[PDB]
Amino acid sequence: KQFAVIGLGRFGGSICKELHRMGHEVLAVDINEEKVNAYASYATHAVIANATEENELLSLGIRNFEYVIVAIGANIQASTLTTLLLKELDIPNIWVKAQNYYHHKVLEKIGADRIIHPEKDMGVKIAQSLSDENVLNYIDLSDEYSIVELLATRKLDSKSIIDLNVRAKYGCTILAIKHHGDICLSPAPEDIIREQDCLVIMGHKKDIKRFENEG
Amino acid sequence: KQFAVIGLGRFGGSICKELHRMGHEVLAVDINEEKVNAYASYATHAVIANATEENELLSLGIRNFEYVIVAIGANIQASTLTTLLLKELDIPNIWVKAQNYYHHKVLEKIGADRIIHPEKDMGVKIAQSLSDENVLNYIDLSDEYSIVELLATRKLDSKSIIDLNVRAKYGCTILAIKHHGDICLSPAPEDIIREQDCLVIMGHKKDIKRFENEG
Amino acid sequence: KQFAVIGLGRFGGSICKELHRMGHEVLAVDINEEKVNAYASYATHAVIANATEENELLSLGIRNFEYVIVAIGANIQASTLTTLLLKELDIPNIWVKAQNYYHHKVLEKIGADRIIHPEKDMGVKIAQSLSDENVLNYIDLSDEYSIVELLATRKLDSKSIIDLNVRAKYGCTILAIKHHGDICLSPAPEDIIREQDCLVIMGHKKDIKRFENEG
Amino acid sequence: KQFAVIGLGRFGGSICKELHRMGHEVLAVDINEEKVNAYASYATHAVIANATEENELLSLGIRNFEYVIVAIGANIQASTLTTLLLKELDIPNIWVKAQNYYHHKVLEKIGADRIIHPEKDMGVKIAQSLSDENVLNYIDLSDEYSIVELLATRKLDSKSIIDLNVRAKYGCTILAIKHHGDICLSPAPEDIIREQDCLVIMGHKKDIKRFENEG
Ligand SMILES: Nc1ncnc2c1ncn2[C@@H]1O[C@H](COP(=O)(O)OP(=O)(O)OP(=O)(O)O)[C@@H](O)[C@H]1O
Ligand SMILES: Nc1ncnc2c1ncn2[C@@H]1O[C@H](COP(=O)(O)OP(=O)(O)OP(=O)(O)O)[C@@H](O)[C@H]1O
Ligand SMILES: Nc1ncnc2c1ncn2[C@@H]1O[C@H](COP(=O)(O)OP(=O)(O)OP(=O)(O)O)[C@@H](O)[C@H]1O
Ligand SMILES: Nc1ncnc2c1ncn2[C@@H]1O[C@H](COP(=O)(O)OP(=O)(O)OP(=O)(O)O)[C@@H](O)[C@H]1O
Ligand code: NA
Ligand code: NA
């Protein structure tokens, strides 16, 4: 797999550094000279180029990349023109970072395979942690079911798993308990719940909220 | 709970809209007139103010907010001077959006309770999906254990749960299977695995990668 | 018919002045204060507004206009987001002025009913007059047939229509002859051809060029 | 014929590409480095130069060109100083693209052989098509007579030429009928008029409008 990342910002530069860490061939393209010099050591190849130009895009050998990530999310004109060129060049996978709702609609029309909202998705996840401080990290399996990594309270100290009627009353299944950097995978009844550490739970979205308030 | 969000960007405006959707009192503060007019309907109170000024900050009644989120991640001077004022005003919870590694170190010194990297965290999660297309969304329970929502392949079609020796060989536990918008919570042996839909699994980080390659 | 012209440039301001001359209700929208003040007397209604904003676009009553002309041809971001909003608002006819080939392709994707190249079409017509000074104005009926308003040469002076074997040899039909501000519609054989005045001809594109060189 | 085009914009670059297509020697002059690199392949010779400088203008051998086209229509100072130099250098034909009415008056004073308004002429032609949707393209032979390429309506279907009394009542002559990419030159009575395709007509300006309303 050969990856090309166009636009070395906070979001684009993180993809370059992570893919280079995993041992992947990454082409880092940016119009800024200082950005390319900073990410020259964090990419297989770093080029100072304008992606809105077809002649400069063909000089990179961009047709040899299966995945191209257009991480420009503040210039709609630069973002939409780039993916119009890549779609014309028959790139199998174009992932674009969008800015707002209207930018999302343009990229969907001109054939962007996946459209990403990094700050919008994180802001929704952060606002869930602000509203309820008991949660630490959650993953939405669907619109009604989710896996929530809860934080243990003071009332849950010295409590066994069989004491908590999550399976019967709340209809939720405890998945894993982490104690002081040691994680217990699929605990069996019964285990004593320690102080304020991680507690992974799975259930309906409304059912987990009932467990937090009651227990 | 009263929340104040300072800086209505892509990240800050998403927290305002999500907290207002949940029914929370949100104060939206921005130095830009156009940003405040756009988010006036998505916040309980929207004020055009400079947060680096103590006199303007005290005019907002900012001492009445338990949570203040400083969502300025491109102006380090504006971000660090705001949280210095809020720390001086004894705000119990200050959550700051950082820009790079050096901005993270300054905010840790001047007393930021939680420091957030929205684009850096999403770029790491996106790069995991680029490297392995079988994964869809994952949550890191620890540095060695994670819950990965896999995507079913063609070889897993018409296969039962008991046929897959994930519990014995791979040491991984299947958590939930979603079929065409219908999610089965904690499936029992045995269930037929359908076509390319969601498949939630839990196990060691290295053990899940073995399951993807072999099966 | 109610027309809205967005962008009062050299091209947009000409549509406003011509439609207002014919007695049509024209809404002139521009983001520049000086442009609106200049065209306030040449439009039924002139508003200073940003067309990329949906709230400002709905304040104009833009849903009441059958034809909206987006005459912005130097800002691709402003041009493509305006027509995305108008397409979302179900405007029956959206005519957009494009900048280059790539801007033409974006507007075709997001549903522009007619795309106009004013300078590109005039430059092609002007370059035809530079290459052959005998022509004055031409209209392309098809890719092989055209009506060319020729200019009479010195060798065509004191020549009758029957003397010119355009119908038999060249396969071209003389349409109209203009003499000193007096235009003769469909002349009959034979009429004396005067000095260097207009001479409208119709025929194949290659056949007219043979007539110019030989006669 | 040797042509020089000064200013490679939307209008100037179209003249360069069209004249180069016809097989003419074109000198493309622009002050922008990126414009010259783009049109280097579409011109015989492309030079990065400032046309307001006499020393740079004489380095191009501009005295060897019969036609010079000054396609600068947004900088009046650059446009008027260029044609003052070319008039001083005794260029036989100087064609200048103007911006407004006052720019047209200056160029007429300092000796511009032909002054062109590309957006103003297209805006007038476009506004004629907006006012009456039956017309497609027209050419003004004079102030009272024109050739209009009409669009066939539903009431003109299955109608013969002799049925339409354009020659007797309206005083208009049908010139050519185009059917599905096939163009009939000077049709003879009688031909059946098909569905909504091109229909070229010639007559007085007021007489054609009567034909559209009645038929
Ligand atoms: N036409 C272009 N071609 C290549 N790179 C470009 C182009 N235009 C902008 N860039 C670069 O893309 C990077 C990211 O774009 P920008 O800063 O506008 O977006 P952003 O949404 O604010 O970024 P992020 O949130 O990832 O920090 C910048 O380093 C910028 O220099
Ligand atoms: N001193 C300040 N007080 C209040 N708001 C401010 C101040 N300085 C900047 N802002 C606002 O904060 C918002 C977000 O800041 P900025 O755009 O610099 O950061 P960012 O990291 O690029 O944002 P995001 O990624 O969330 O789009 C902007 O709307 C900006 O106007
Ligand atoms: N978002 C916008 N909303 C409304 N008007 C706008 C907007 N952006 C630009 N305009 C106006 O549109 C007009 C024409 O746009 P612009 O000058 O960028 O294009 P152009 O192709 O150079 O124009 P022209 O060739 O017709 O002179 C200008 O008067 C400009 O102020
Ligand atoms: N002094 C100069 N000498 C040569 N070229 C020039 C000079 N000044 C401007 N130009 C170039 O002339 C070109 C056209 O000029 P400009 O863009 O100002 O006019 P315009 O009327 O907006 O153009 P168009 O409608 O053809 O796009 C531009 O590429 C510009 O760089
Ligand atoms: Na950002
Ligand atoms: Na123009």
Coordinates of all heavy atoms in Angstrom, one line a residue, chain A residues 10 97 119, chain B residues 10 97 119, ligand 5:
Chain A
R10 N -2.4 20.0 11.1 CA -2.5 19.2 12.3 C -3.1 17.8 12.0 O -2.7 16.8 12.7 CB -3.3 19.9 13.3 CG -2.6 21.1 13.9 CD -3.6 22.0 14.7 NE -4.6 22.7 13.8 CZ -5.5 23.5 14.2 NH1 -5.6 23.9 15.4 NH2 -6.3 24.0 13.3
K97 N -10.8 15.6 4.0 CA -11.2 16.3 5.2 C -12.1 17.5 4.9 O -11.6 18.4 4.2 CB -10.0 16.7 6.0 CG -10.1 17.7 7.1 CD -8.8 18.2 7.5 CE -8.9 19.4 8.5 NZ -9.4 18.9 9.9
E119 N -12.6 17.7 13.7 CA -12.9 18.5 14.8 C -14.4 18.3 15.2 O -14.7 18.4 16.4 CB -12.6 19.9 14.5 CG -11.2 20.2 14.1 CD -11.1 20.2 12.6 OE1 -12.1 19.8 11.9 OE2 -10.0 20.5 12.1
Chain B
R10 N -14.4 25.0 14.2 CA -14.9 23.7 13.9 C -15.0 22.8 15.1 O -16.0 22.1 15.2 CB -14.0 23.1 12.8 CG -14.1 23.7 11.5 CD -13.0 23.2 10.6 NE -11.7 23.7 11.0 CZ -10.6 23.5 10.3 NH1 -10.6 22.7 9.2 NH2 -9.5 24.0 10.8
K97 N -7.9 23.1 24.0 CA -7.6 22.4 22.8 C -6.2 22.9 22.4 O -5.9 24.1 22.2 CB -8.6 22.8 21.7 CG -8.1 22.6 20.3 CD -9.1 23.2 19.3 CE -8.6 23.2 17.9 NZ -8.7 21.8 17.3
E119 N -7.5 17.0 16.1 CA -7.0 16.5 14.8 C -5.9 15.4 14.9 O -5.8 14.5 14.1 CB -6.4 17.6 14.0 CG -7.4 18.8 13.8 CD -7.2 19.9 14.9 OE1 -6.4 19.6 15.8 OE2 -7.9 20.9 14.8
Ligands
NA5 NA -8.4 22.4 12.7

